[PDB]
Amino acid sequence: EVETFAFQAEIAQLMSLIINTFYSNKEIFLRELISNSSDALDKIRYESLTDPSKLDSGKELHINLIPNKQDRTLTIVDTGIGMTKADLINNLGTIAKSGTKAFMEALQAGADISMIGQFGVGFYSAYLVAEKVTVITKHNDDEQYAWESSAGGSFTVRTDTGEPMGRGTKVILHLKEDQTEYLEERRIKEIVKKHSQFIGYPITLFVE
Ligand SMILES: CCCc1cc(-n2c(=O)[nH]c3ccccc32)c(O)cc1O
After folding, report:
1. CATH code of the domain covering residue 139
2. How far is the CA of 108 from the centre of ligand 1 (A)?
3. Is the CB of residue 76 less than 8 Å from the CB of residue 34?
């Protein structure tokens, strides 16, 4: 059972802009995804202060970076609060309609694509380097779901019965053929040190 949805016009326009605009500084996609993981981890940390049972689905708060050269994928895994099915469908928990508007207005006032995260739509910077993105998530209040999109105006949502996660979100980037540098250990280390050196959770870079 696969459900197919149309992106709202503003989000489809944002995705087309990220895919078709000439912009060389693509590495910022990783900072944006680590930042989103950190926000998810802050949220489960805060909720767990008053209700420690929210950590029954996993006490470890961390971020893993998993490159796979054979599949040409870079996966970012976190054990944050996760997302419900309703949040996935509602632009992955983002204010994507108003955020896209504010980002578009900023771009005309002197901003560049690297400032995308300031408008709450940093997730979509994944399309600077990925031809397809799969988001697997598990929130304490819902079942495990997989969201997927190759852009083109639509996304799918399905239940995910393979590999239960416990709690959190997994973003799988199916890299564009000319963006395989982001699977190289030295390149990932460089980007984490440059843009994410002070994140408040352990970031483990897996090796092959
Ligand atoms: C999948 C869209 C963006 C994104 C979102 C999340 N995320 C969640 O899964 N729950 C969140 C609650 C607050 C902030 C970000 C959250 C994440 O853990 C990683 C991630 O890359």
Report:
1. 3.30.565.10
2. 28
3. yes
